[PDB]
Amino acid sequence: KLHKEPATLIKAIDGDTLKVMYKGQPMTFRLLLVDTPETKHPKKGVEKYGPEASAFTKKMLENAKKIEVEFDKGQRTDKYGRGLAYIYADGKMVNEALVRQGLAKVAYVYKPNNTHEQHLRKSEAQAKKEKLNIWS
């Protein structure tokens, strides 16, 4: 059973990565299950819809009253020390909002961190069917 925990925005870094104050410490979070185009991609740098994905996550988190983090049932950090979570702005899941707008694809999924996988896949199918952004 997953639960939401409160957090405080520090700074949105990219479409898929946000720095947040969690249990009293600054920590970088990577959004579970989604791949956004990147503005600071390691080899590629600035990719198409990268700035759009970045602005969308930024606006959503910065304008929220309440930001919450929800860990999945598996590992809670990746190999770079980033928290792996679903992030909610005023009760809306950011991870889902991105996929629903055609600003992210559903990532390759690693069990047991796959709880909302079906839900995200459905939004992705909708965004493809609507030909939004990445899908047009």
Swiss-Prot record:
It comes from the Bacteria. It is found in: Secreted. The active site is at R30, E38, R82. This is Nuclease A. Residues 116-132 have a biased composition (Basic and acidic residues). The gene is nuc. Ca(2+) binds at D16, D35, T36. Residues 116-136 are annotated as: Disordered.
